[PDB]
Structure formats: structure tokens, C-alpha cells
Amino acid sequence: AMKAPELQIQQWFNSATDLTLADLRGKVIVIEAFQMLCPGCVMHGIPLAQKVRAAFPEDKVAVLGLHTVFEHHEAMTPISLKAFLHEYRIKFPVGVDQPGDGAMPRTMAAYQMRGTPSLLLIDKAGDLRAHHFGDVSELLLGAEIATLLGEAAP
Amino acid sequence: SNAMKAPELQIQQWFNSATDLTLADLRGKVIVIEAFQMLCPGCVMHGIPLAQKVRAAFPEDKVAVLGLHTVFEHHEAMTPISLKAFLHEYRIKFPVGVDQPGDGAMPRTMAAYQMRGTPSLLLIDKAGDLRAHHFGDVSELLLGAEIATLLGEAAP
Amino acid sequence: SNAMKAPELQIQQWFNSATDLTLADLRGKVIVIEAFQMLCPGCVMHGIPLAQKVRAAFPEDKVAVLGLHTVFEHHEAMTPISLKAFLHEYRIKFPVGVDQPGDGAMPRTMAAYQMRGTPSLLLIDKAGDLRAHHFGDVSELLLGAEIATLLGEAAPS
Amino acid sequence: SNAMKAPELQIQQWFNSATDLTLADLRGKVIVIEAFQMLCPGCVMHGIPLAQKVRAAFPEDKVAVLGLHTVFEHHEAMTPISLKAFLHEYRIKFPVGVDQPGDGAMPRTMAAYQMRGTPSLLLIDKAGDLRAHHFGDVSELLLGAEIATLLGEAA
């Protein structure tokens, strides 16, 4: 039906461990898929993910970044991303999506994302429940997160 | 004046420019230089958009707008390959010069101008003298006033 | 036993390789890894020519030879665009992996292996265990002896 | 004279030098210029060591030794960013000038001297005329002889 595909991560930043979705079962998971050089991610996507992180507690809601480099690959390598996350004070876990055989990296391809910024919501069972591309109403995102937090744990 | 000649640009490479621009090529124009780092949040939010507003407000024949990429930290994260993509993604079309690597962390032009950080905005007159040097937030009213003052002066 | 476990490679990208190579992929081969920086004079003068001799002296079916670009200084001078040109000019044709950036200066695989600098030469047995770890100058007679010893050992499974 | 006047250097940036050096600055000294690319194996193995051998054999006051980084291929791989680190790693301390990038692949000093490739070694006399232009391997005996001859000529 709707099981969220496993993350395929080359390298994690801001994380002691190699996080998987299975590690996060029982939490609502918000994934911000972004490119560090995408003006919409920097202006809207990343700040939204920071608002979510600030508005909901860690024990109930996981917020993750997924750096899905599908263009200008040499300009946005993990060494660039490391500096990005430092300069923009981004503290939540951020996974480098595993580069693919072509332009799109593996997690992006598995989720059939249209590009960036994309926001994915996974429920406590690990099912994919929303997938927003571009601008997101904060009111409606809040509504969706609440709907998922009000559901029973597996 | 007690004004002094603007030191010559020391550029490693140019983006968005058919030629290797010098301040001497630009003699007779008022020159606006936006010194920035591409991973500096204040440069991306305020400094570059301000330089674009100047470009849109004044004609090319009268006012030159240049970007100067002055990387003084995280050098490996802001190499010319990254800058090229950044200019493309942000649709920045005016000429942008990569400042040459310095003896230490600060690059050559930045040091020559004794710049204190980024974003910094420099204004050079028709005669090639440095007339303003702003670090950080700049009032658009004040900036327009200064540019008009320099435009109102007789060509050299 | 003196056979410590070999950490999994943490690589950002590969040159001269169709696939993302892992040590698990290479199980059953003796693996020689040359960890180098492209601007390190000892790597250019000695380490890389040694890796190429190993590659020429042993068959690909039995011995894998891998380069690991472990940039721990002057990071901006030794980025992958620079490495690509270096591998071309020096005709280095075996797979070369760029070590992932670390928390600090040292990259991740280099730190995992507790390397002292470059060049370093690491030898991993058919079972995936680290068996030698040489820093700097290496005796070709003694390295050839170590590779034979490892090749002499029974396959795993 | 006998010999073509050496064309002016067209340098984007100098390393290991307090000033923007010119051939005119060095009138009255014999000048040895080693044109090289930092990723060129023959430059690293033979050309730069030769320049260093010259610098060690002859006093600073009589013989100037300059490097000229003439990047004509893999341009993006050998910028001054990478050259700064290379000079440090290899402990090259003599003045090194980045040749001004050209319109095409060849930078401007390289094109002005019609160099065949790297390493190339140029010899300029005390009067500023080009007296030798070598490509690839150079005989140290021959080079020493050529330098002595130029050093033997009047002011």
C-alpha cells in the first residue's frame, strides 16, 4: 500500500548514528528534501523544517534533512554541505542522499520526488502519508502533523 | 578630497564577463562593488539582492555593478565550481570576480581594501577614487543618494 | 592473532570504477589500499608508483588495488576536479575513492584506520581483516612477501 | 642585436615575492625562467628540481630564478588556489608567477614566447635578450655553460 521506502544515505551530518526509518518507528517523521544551492530551499524549505523542529517535541516528531543533489553535483558535495549547515546553523540530522547511476540520487528516485524543496510526512507505522513539492501552508502542514500524532502507535 | 585611489582588482577569474574587467576599463562610470561569500546567509538575503536592485535602478552606461567573491573561510566549500552553480541558481547576471588567494585566509582584493567582513559594498567614483565602503546593512535611501552624488560629478 | 577488523570504506565518490566499491564486494581477494594526497611529494614520488607496481605484479582476480584520496590539509587545493586531472596526468587507472569529509580536518576512513599520514599502505586479507598498515617508505621485498602470505591463506565462506 | 628582446611577462599573480616582478626590474642579472604546470609529471620530477639546482648553484645577486605557472590544460584543476598549496608542500621558495589566462587554452606569456609545452626553461641575458629556450630535458652541463657565458658578459 503506502510503506515509506528506506533511506539510502551516503553520509550523515548532525547525527551520532546512522539513522534509519525503523529507528524512528512510533514517531511522526518530517523529511525536508533540499539542495543547498536551491534558492527555494534556502528561503522557504529549510526555514519551514526549522519551524517544525521548534514547534513539536523530539520525542513525538523526528525532523530530518535529506540533501538530494540531482544537479550541479560537483558544486554541492558533502564538504560544501558541511560548511552550509554550519553557516546556516542547521542542527537536525541531515543525510546525503546516495548518488545514483544517473543524475538523481537513490532515495529521491525511490520516492519519485519532482525536485526540491520537497517535504515528506511519515506516520508512526512508517507509511508515507504526505509528499509536498514546493510551497507548503504552515496551517495545513500543522493540521497533517497533528492528524498523524493523534493516531495510535503500531 | 581626502579621498584615495581605489586599489586595482586582483581577480583569479571572472564569471558573466566577456573580458577581464579592470577598474581602468570602467573609468568614467560610477562603480558599485558587492563583496560577498556565497555561503554567507547575510550576503544571500541582503547583500546580493541589494546589488541586483542597484543594477535594475541605474543604466549600464552610467553605473557598473560588480560582484567580488571574497572567500576568507571554508575555502573548499566555495571554490569557483560551486560559485558558478550558485550564480546560475540565483540568476545573478552581472560580472562577478573571484578574489585571488592571499598569503593567509583573506584573499588579495579584500585585504587591499581592508574589508572587515561580508557583505561589504564599495563605491568608486568616475575618477577611480574609493568614496564609500559599507560593511553589513546599507540603507537603500543613503546608497541611492551617494550614487547620485557621484553621478552628478563631472567626468574625469 | 594480530588481525584487527578493517573498517568499511566511507567514500564520497569513485574514479576509475563502474560501481561503488566496498570491502564486502572484494571479499576473497587480498586488498591493497594506497592512501595518498595528490600534493604530497612522498605520495607522488613513492606511494603511487608502489601501488602501480603492485597492480602490475599481481593478477586482478587475486589482488585488488585501490587508491584512497585522504585529504587532511589544504582541502581547497585537492578537490575532486583537481584529483581527476591528477589521475589523468599520472595515468593512474585503478579505482580511486575520495575519502568522506570528517568532523575535523581528517577525513572519515583515514580516521577510522588511525592513519598517521600519507602515504600509507594497508593490506586486508581474504577474510576482510586488516593485516598490515605501513606509513611512508615500504620494502618491496617485504610487501611482496606479505601479499604472498595472504594469498597463501584459504578462501573464506 | 643577435638575439630577440625577451617579451614582457604577463602575470596574473605572484607567489613568493614582495613585489610585482618584471624583466625590467631584473636588468643586469641573468634570468632563468622555469615554465611548468603543477600537475605535469615531468615538471615535478625534472623541471622544478632543475630550477632549484640552479638557484642553489648561483648567487641571488647574479642570477634570478623565476617559476612561471603556464596552465594550458586542465585549467580548473590547477588554479592559484591549488598552486598556493603545491608551492607550500614542495617547499618551493623562489618567485613564481601565474601566467595570465589567455582567450584560448594557452595563457599569455606562454603564447608570447611560443613555448612548446612544459617544462620549458628560458635564459635571458643581462641586457634582457632571450638567449636560450629549452623544452623538456636539459643537460645540466650545458645549462651551467650557458649561464656562465651570460654571466661573463659586460653589464
XYZ file of C-alpha atoms in Angstrom:
622
model
C 0.000 0.000 0.000
C 1.983 3.039 1.317
C 5.161 1.902 3.168
C 7.823 4.671 3.012
C 10.949 3.444 1.126
C 14.071 3.015 3.271
C 16.506 5.947 3.340
C 19.639 5.343 1.248
C 22.211 7.661 2.845
C 25.856 8.073 1.882
C 26.855 10.146 4.918
C 25.047 11.616 7.947
C 25.689 15.072 9.392
C 24.466 16.195 12.898
C 23.894 12.591 13.992
C 25.752 10.209 16.303
C 24.264 7.211 14.453
C 23.325 6.025 11.000
C 19.580 6.753 11.336
C 17.024 4.546 9.621
C 13.238 4.930 9.438
C 12.982 1.743 11.530
C 14.962 3.519 14.286
C 12.188 6.145 14.239
C 9.107 3.853 14.334
C 6.494 5.284 16.680
C 7.413 8.900 15.835
C 5.943 11.106 13.123
C 8.795 11.801 10.690
C 9.187 15.011 8.694
C 11.747 14.883 5.909
C 12.891 18.047 4.188
C 14.482 17.138 0.863
C 16.635 20.046 -0.345
C 19.662 21.183 -2.352
C 21.952 23.669 -0.613
C 22.128 25.878 -3.741
C 18.348 25.862 -4.461
C 17.036 29.353 -3.610
C 13.598 27.990 -2.650
C 15.164 25.536 -0.170
C 17.262 28.232 1.472
C 14.445 30.810 1.567
C 11.464 28.570 2.440
C 12.142 24.849 2.670
C 14.871 24.812 5.310
C 13.248 27.558 7.468
C 9.969 25.550 7.395
C 11.764 22.408 8.639
C 13.359 24.527 11.418
C 9.881 25.819 12.390
C 8.585 22.260 12.608
C 11.563 21.196 14.738
C 10.890 24.159 17.057
C 7.117 23.660 17.200
C 6.924 19.939 18.015
C 8.921 17.961 20.595
C 11.709 15.495 19.671
C 10.089 12.547 21.423
C 6.980 12.795 19.199
C 8.300 14.220 15.890
C 11.549 13.465 14.031
C 12.806 16.192 11.661
C 15.432 15.138 9.086
C 17.141 16.835 6.165
C 17.860 14.902 3.011
C 20.400 16.511 0.654
C 19.191 15.278 -2.740
C 21.776 16.501 -5.221
C 20.435 15.876 -8.709
C 22.073 18.840 -10.455
C 25.441 20.714 -10.296
C 26.695 17.613 -8.467
C 30.378 18.782 -8.175
C 29.271 22.153 -6.706
C 27.273 20.605 -3.831
C 29.402 17.786 -2.429
C 29.353 16.814 1.264
C 32.351 19.028 2.067
C 30.295 22.036 0.768
C 27.246 20.867 2.654
C 29.249 20.619 5.921
C 30.077 24.350 5.656
C 26.479 25.195 4.611
C 24.949 23.517 7.668
C 27.486 25.234 9.901
C 26.914 28.751 8.447
C 23.138 28.402 8.446
C 23.070 26.886 11.994
C 21.157 23.777 10.898
C 21.314 21.300 13.808
C 18.883 18.476 12.989
C 20.170 15.259 11.316
C 20.954 15.700 7.608
C 21.616 12.708 5.323
C 23.437 12.945 1.971
C 21.253 11.016 -0.437
C 23.274 8.159 -2.023
C 24.390 9.330 -5.501
C 22.636 7.304 -8.243
C 23.882 5.839 -11.525
C 22.386 8.874 -13.272
C 21.593 12.376 -12.099
C 19.015 11.553 -9.395
C 20.230 10.110 -6.115
C 18.759 6.863 -4.776
C 16.320 7.989 -2.076
C 14.979 10.816 -4.260
C 14.406 8.272 -7.074
C 12.728 5.744 -4.687
C 10.297 8.425 -3.522
C 9.744 9.764 -7.075
C 10.361 13.325 -5.961
C 9.812 16.106 -8.507
C 12.744 18.155 -7.206
C 13.371 20.476 -4.307
C 12.189 21.587 -1.826
C 10.022 18.524 -1.121
C 8.517 17.718 2.261
C 7.570 14.153 3.203
C 5.491 13.095 6.232
C 5.805 9.542 7.532
C 3.362 8.192 10.163
C 4.169 6.231 13.310
C 3.900 2.928 11.336
C 6.414 4.087 8.724
C 3.874 4.705 5.950
C 4.335 7.689 3.646
C 1.346 9.969 4.268
C 2.089 13.329 2.542
C 4.570 14.424 -0.072
C 4.595 18.173 -0.779
C 6.607 19.749 -3.600
C 7.307 23.489 -3.333
C 5.370 25.897 -1.059
C 3.515 24.419 1.940
C 0.760 26.092 4.001
C 2.012 26.065 7.581
C -1.589 25.900 8.829
C -2.280 22.807 6.743
C 1.058 21.159 7.498
C 0.357 21.628 11.210
C -3.072 20.058 10.668
C -1.486 16.993 8.972
C 1.204 16.568 11.635
C -1.492 16.665 14.339
C -3.623 14.147 12.416
C -0.661 11.755 12.413
C 0.249 12.376 16.085
C -3.377 11.616 17.044
C -3.098 8.120 15.501
C -2.323 5.021 17.572
C 1.260 3.637 17.723
C 1.821 0.252 15.903
C 39.282 65.484 -1.387
C 40.964 63.400 1.283
C 39.708 60.504 -0.919
C 42.239 57.940 -2.202
C 42.542 55.889 -5.384
C 40.672 52.541 -5.222
C 43.259 49.706 -5.347
C 43.171 47.687 -8.595
C 41.138 44.448 -8.518
C 43.203 41.272 -8.158
C 40.965 38.674 -9.736
C 41.652 34.974 -10.371
C 38.729 34.570 -12.815
C 35.536 36.323 -13.969
C 32.014 34.969 -14.359
C 29.426 36.706 -16.513
C 32.059 38.746 -18.365
C 33.357 38.536 -21.906
C 36.588 40.305 -20.837
C 38.961 40.557 -17.803
C 37.437 43.739 -16.360
C 39.636 46.265 -14.618
C 38.720 49.458 -12.781
C 40.657 51.264 -15.561
C 38.271 49.815 -18.219
C 35.456 51.356 -16.136
C 36.864 54.877 -15.770
C 34.040 57.415 -16.290
C 31.442 55.155 -14.695
C 30.409 55.096 -11.051
C 31.332 51.575 -9.881
C 29.404 49.583 -7.268
C 31.189 46.502 -5.895
C 29.391 43.915 -3.750
C 31.922 41.753 -1.903
C 30.253 38.568 -0.696
C 30.648 34.902 0.232
C 28.150 32.534 -1.342
C 27.603 30.644 1.956
C 27.163 33.832 3.982
C 23.420 33.999 4.878
C 23.532 37.821 5.070
C 25.136 38.042 1.619
C 22.422 35.811 0.113
C 19.453 37.514 1.896
C 20.539 41.174 1.794
C 23.850 41.921 0.004
C 23.306 40.321 -3.384
C 19.640 41.359 -3.630
C 20.768 44.941 -2.897
C 23.379 44.758 -5.697
C 20.663 43.488 -8.062
C 18.396 46.412 -7.070
C 21.218 48.854 -7.947
C 21.759 47.122 -11.288
C 17.984 47.430 -12.039
C 17.781 51.102 -10.863
C 20.670 52.610 -12.876
C 21.682 52.216 -16.521
C 24.748 50.156 -17.552
C 26.239 53.152 -19.329
C 26.349 55.174 -16.161
C 26.854 52.722 -13.280
C 28.883 49.475 -13.314
C 27.788 46.800 -10.789
C 30.371 44.070 -9.972
C 30.345 41.135 -7.584
C 33.581 40.200 -5.866
C 33.659 36.710 -4.383
C 35.913 37.179 -1.320
C 36.266 33.740 0.321
C 38.080 34.087 3.667
C 36.758 30.881 5.374
C 35.535 27.382 4.361
C 37.620 27.783 1.181
C 36.957 24.229 -0.037
C 33.170 24.758 0.132
C 33.191 27.908 -2.069
C 35.554 27.077 -4.956
C 34.855 28.515 -8.454
C 32.936 25.321 -9.435
C 30.475 25.976 -6.562
C 30.312 29.711 -7.332
C 29.398 29.025 -10.996
C 26.420 26.870 -9.886
C 25.413 29.455 -7.281
C 25.369 32.282 -9.835
C 23.320 30.113 -12.169
C 20.819 29.033 -9.480
C 20.357 32.555 -8.160
C 20.205 34.078 -11.726
C 22.928 36.547 -10.981
C 23.923 38.092 -14.335
C 26.295 40.977 -13.532
C 30.097 40.346 -13.652
C 31.499 38.516 -10.611
C 35.207 38.180 -9.986
C 36.855 35.506 -7.810
C 39.248 37.314 -5.481
C 42.843 35.851 -5.598
C 44.063 33.671 -2.681
C 46.003 35.672 -0.106
C 49.068 34.918 1.981
C 46.654 33.880 4.758
C 42.887 33.237 4.888
C 41.794 36.582 3.415
C 42.002 36.964 -0.344
C 44.026 39.715 -2.052
C 41.492 42.388 -3.062
C 39.583 42.094 0.216
C 42.842 42.705 2.101
C 43.919 45.555 -0.168
C 40.606 47.308 0.550
C 40.950 46.459 4.277
C 37.450 44.962 4.211
C 36.208 43.851 7.656
C 33.865 41.043 6.532
C 30.983 40.287 4.110
C 28.687 41.579 2.775
C 30.621 44.785 2.078
C 29.652 47.374 -0.542
C 32.205 49.734 -2.115
C 31.510 52.801 -4.215
C 34.126 54.067 -6.664
C 33.764 57.438 -8.483
C 34.196 58.311 -12.219
C 37.862 59.204 -11.469
C 38.678 55.868 -9.810
C 38.723 57.040 -6.190
C 37.071 54.972 -3.402
C 34.286 57.154 -1.983
C 32.261 54.800 0.283
C 32.836 51.460 1.974
C 29.962 49.912 3.878
C 30.098 46.737 5.917
C 26.796 44.922 6.512
C 23.364 46.614 6.329
C 23.112 49.585 3.984
C 20.164 51.999 3.731
C 18.836 51.997 0.130
C 17.919 55.709 0.516
C 21.505 56.574 1.577
C 23.052 54.394 -1.105
C 20.939 55.945 -3.875
C 21.889 59.388 -2.502
C 25.631 58.555 -2.639
C 25.409 57.079 -6.160
C 23.546 60.197 -7.384
C 26.170 62.419 -5.773
C 28.890 60.601 -7.707
C 26.834 60.540 -10.939
C 26.395 64.293 -10.607
C 30.148 64.895 -10.688
C 31.982 65.910 -13.883
C 33.659 63.055 -15.802
C 37.476 62.907 -15.296
C 46.421 -13.084 16.081
C 47.374 -9.514 15.000
C 44.426 -9.324 12.556
C 42.297 -6.353 13.548
C 38.945 -5.764 11.818
C 39.071 -3.493 8.721
C 36.514 -0.609 8.924
C 34.104 -0.256 5.968
C 35.316 2.380 3.411
C 33.477 5.684 3.720
C 33.783 7.155 0.251
C 32.259 10.303 -1.270
C 32.919 9.335 -4.891
C 34.950 6.889 -7.009
C 37.186 7.452 -10.042
C 38.051 4.627 -12.467
C 35.238 2.449 -11.162
C 31.925 1.457 -12.767
C 30.462 0.834 -9.300
C 30.555 1.995 -5.694
C 33.156 -0.482 -4.394
C 33.044 -1.839 -0.875
C 35.361 -4.137 1.088
C 32.461 -6.646 1.240
C 32.379 -6.659 -2.606
C 36.060 -7.621 -2.522
C 35.776 -10.490 -0.012
C 38.102 -13.352 -1.019
C 40.679 -11.084 -2.700
C 43.688 -9.714 -0.926
C 43.201 -5.931 -0.990
C 45.985 -3.341 -1.154
C 44.945 0.218 -0.346
C 47.195 3.173 -1.048
C 46.070 6.217 0.963
C 47.576 9.344 -0.503
C 47.192 13.096 -1.038
C 47.791 14.296 -4.567
C 50.025 17.203 -3.439
C 52.146 15.166 -1.012
C 55.628 14.761 -2.510
C 56.212 11.298 -0.946
C 52.901 10.019 -2.388
C 53.866 11.191 -5.871
C 57.491 10.071 -5.697
C 56.974 6.704 -3.893
C 53.465 5.688 -2.762
C 51.600 5.881 -6.037
C 54.465 4.280 -8.039
C 54.457 1.470 -5.452
C 50.695 0.920 -5.868
C 51.172 0.726 -9.656
C 53.948 -1.899 -9.229
C 51.674 -3.984 -7.030
C 48.934 -3.667 -9.633
C 51.326 -4.705 -12.407
C 52.876 -7.557 -10.347
C 49.717 -9.407 -9.203
C 46.619 -10.520 -11.135
C 43.324 -8.603 -10.803
C 41.448 -11.802 -9.983
C 43.575 -12.378 -6.892
C 44.623 -8.898 -5.704
C 42.564 -5.708 -5.729
C 44.492 -2.431 -5.664
C 42.558 0.686 -4.583
C 43.619 4.309 -4.121
C 42.147 6.294 -1.237
C 42.470 10.111 -1.531
C 42.634 11.153 2.144
C 42.923 14.925 2.070
C 43.590 16.139 5.629
C 45.069 19.557 4.777
C 44.842 22.225 2.037
C 41.374 20.769 1.298
C 40.560 23.506 -1.252
C 43.665 22.650 -3.327
C 42.910 18.917 -3.645
C 39.195 18.741 -4.551
C 37.822 16.075 -6.944
C 38.158 18.319 -10.068
C 41.879 18.522 -9.220
C 42.153 14.807 -8.463
C 40.523 13.866 -11.795
C 43.273 15.823 -13.660
C 45.986 14.337 -11.453
C 44.832 10.765 -12.140
C 44.809 11.528 -15.871
C 48.332 13.130 -15.993
C 49.912 10.400 -13.942
C 47.986 7.625 -15.744
C 46.563 6.105 -12.577
C 43.984 3.669 -13.881
C 42.998 1.669 -10.761
C 39.925 2.649 -8.689
C 40.420 5.694 -6.527
C 37.963 6.685 -3.776
C 37.676 10.184 -2.289
C 37.523 9.765 1.494
C 34.443 11.435 3.050
C 34.979 14.721 4.944
C 35.351 14.273 8.710
C 34.127 16.195 11.724
C 37.504 17.939 11.660
C 40.416 18.127 9.161
C 40.989 14.361 8.853
C 38.561 12.502 6.571
C 36.413 9.599 7.853
C 38.138 6.449 6.534
C 41.556 7.833 7.361
C 40.443 8.433 10.991
C 38.715 5.023 11.191
C 42.015 3.404 10.224
C 44.069 5.553 12.644
C 46.444 6.511 9.797
C 49.468 8.605 10.709
C 49.700 10.480 7.410
C 50.304 9.744 3.729
C 51.409 7.731 2.004
C 50.029 4.765 3.915
C 49.681 1.296 2.550
C 47.049 -1.028 4.054
C 46.740 -4.770 3.453
C 43.469 -6.577 4.005
C 43.298 -10.370 3.945
C 40.750 -12.569 2.064
C 38.558 -12.573 5.189
C 38.304 -8.744 5.383
C 40.764 -8.279 8.244
C 43.467 -5.633 8.340
C 46.846 -7.385 8.400
C 49.422 -4.700 7.628
C 49.491 -0.931 7.838
C 52.636 0.816 6.548
C 53.332 4.511 6.834
C 55.895 6.049 4.442
C 58.643 4.018 2.753
C 57.913 0.339 2.142
C 60.291 -2.502 1.295
C 59.078 -4.076 -1.949
C 60.640 -7.434 -0.927
C 58.777 -7.425 2.389
C 55.476 -6.212 0.897
C 55.621 -8.920 -1.805
C 56.259 -11.453 0.985
C 53.218 -10.174 2.971
C 50.958 -10.309 -0.116
C 52.062 -13.906 -0.846
C 51.374 -14.947 2.750
C 47.832 -13.559 2.479
C 47.359 -15.146 -0.962
C 48.569 -18.433 0.597
C 45.634 -18.463 3.039
C 42.446 -20.456 2.414
C 39.421 -18.679 0.951
C 36.555 -17.815 3.359
C 32.830 -18.888 3.268
C 71.313 42.566 -31.517
C 71.957 38.887 -32.237
C 69.103 37.919 -30.035
C 65.426 38.775 -29.708
C 64.373 41.023 -26.833
C 62.512 38.831 -24.226
C 58.798 39.740 -24.246
C 57.406 41.282 -21.020
C 55.918 38.820 -18.552
C 52.117 38.897 -18.341
C 51.475 37.719 -14.781
C 48.075 37.380 -13.045
C 49.548 36.819 -9.556
C 52.984 36.416 -7.923
C 53.782 33.912 -5.135
C 56.985 34.139 -3.012
C 57.502 37.797 -3.957
C 57.080 41.058 -2.095
C 56.646 42.943 -5.398
C 55.120 42.533 -8.852
C 58.387 41.465 -10.548
C 59.149 42.471 -14.167
C 62.037 41.626 -16.562
C 62.871 45.347 -16.467
C 63.276 45.064 -12.630
C 65.925 42.398 -13.242
C 68.009 44.124 -15.944
C 71.681 43.408 -15.219
C 71.079 39.888 -13.859
C 70.970 36.660 -15.854
C 67.372 35.366 -15.612
C 66.373 31.716 -15.569
C 62.659 31.066 -16.024
C 61.163 27.609 -15.421
C 57.776 27.353 -17.122
C 55.821 24.481 -15.588
C 52.374 23.042 -14.774
C 51.957 21.693 -11.219
C 50.254 18.504 -12.430
C 52.766 17.788 -15.162
C 54.829 14.706 -14.061
C 57.987 15.844 -15.905
C 57.783 19.304 -14.292
C 57.525 17.804 -10.818
C 60.217 15.146 -11.419
C 62.735 17.098 -13.569
C 61.886 20.730 -14.349
C 61.337 22.167 -10.863
C 64.245 20.192 -9.342
C 66.466 21.662 -12.098
C 65.296 25.210 -11.285
C 66.080 24.559 -7.606
C 69.548 23.161 -8.588
C 70.223 26.464 -10.478
C 69.005 28.576 -7.540
C 71.357 26.597 -5.198
C 74.400 26.760 -7.529
C 74.360 30.536 -8.358
C 74.143 33.606 -6.022
C 70.875 35.643 -5.785
C 72.779 38.776 -6.771
C 73.939 37.385 -10.148
C 71.184 35.010 -11.293
C 67.439 35.406 -10.867
C 65.353 32.203 -10.864
C 61.650 32.503 -11.528
C 58.862 29.992 -11.930
C 56.070 30.626 -14.404
C 52.933 28.538 -13.953
C 51.717 28.272 -17.560
C 48.398 26.469 -17.300
C 47.284 25.410 -20.794
C 45.167 22.304 -19.996
C 43.010 21.070 -17.044
C 42.696 24.798 -16.229
C 40.077 24.322 -13.477
C 42.312 21.714 -11.774
C 45.367 23.906 -11.379
C 44.191 27.323 -10.301
C 46.197 29.546 -7.991
C 44.154 28.025 -5.098
C 45.905 24.656 -5.843
C 49.250 26.288 -6.734
C 49.457 28.038 -3.325
C 49.255 24.628 -1.584
C 51.621 22.937 -4.087
C 54.362 25.541 -3.524
C 53.990 25.044 0.236
C 54.034 21.189 0.078
C 57.031 21.123 -2.263
C 58.828 23.950 -0.340
C 59.460 25.998 -3.483
C 60.635 29.403 -2.275
C 61.694 31.242 -5.437
C 59.272 33.753 -7.031
C 56.520 32.024 -9.026
C 54.171 33.888 -11.339
C 50.791 32.659 -12.562
C 50.730 33.215 -16.308
C 47.703 35.466 -17.217
C 44.950 33.218 -18.646
C 44.507 33.724 -22.364
C 41.459 33.703 -24.562
C 42.063 30.088 -25.597
C 43.857 27.258 -23.797
C 47.334 28.926 -23.744
C 47.998 31.700 -21.217
C 49.556 34.962 -22.467
C 53.252 34.718 -21.522
C 53.342 31.161 -22.915
C 51.832 32.341 -26.212
C 54.193 35.394 -26.280
C 57.183 33.095 -26.019
C 55.653 30.453 -28.389
C 56.513 27.698 -25.852
C 56.071 24.088 -26.990
C 54.826 22.757 -23.659
C 56.119 22.178 -20.131
C 58.650 22.018 -18.716
C 60.356 24.787 -20.685
C 63.426 26.706 -19.496
C 64.199 30.243 -20.719
C 67.512 32.025 -20.391
C 67.609 35.820 -20.528
C 70.845 37.808 -20.558
C 71.804 40.892 -18.531
C 70.529 43.096 -21.381
C 67.074 41.472 -21.469
C 67.524 39.479 -24.687
C 66.320 35.861 -24.810
C 69.383 33.655 -25.348
C 68.090 30.106 -24.865
C 64.729 28.402 -24.893
C 64.706 24.718 -23.926
C 61.794 22.285 -23.965
C 61.805 19.020 -21.945
C 65.082 17.501 -20.660
C 68.014 19.888 -20.206
C 71.690 18.970 -19.814
C 72.987 20.406 -16.528
C 76.491 20.665 -18.036
C 75.131 22.629 -20.998
C 72.927 24.812 -18.796
C 75.847 25.620 -16.468
C 77.962 26.501 -19.501
C 75.221 28.788 -20.914
C 74.701 30.565 -17.619
C 78.460 31.131 -17.163
C 78.702 32.616 -20.653
C 75.904 35.087 -19.939
C 77.385 35.885 -16.546
C 80.712 36.560 -18.370
C 79.299 39.396 -20.483
C 79.564 43.123 -19.697
C 76.871 44.922 -17.636
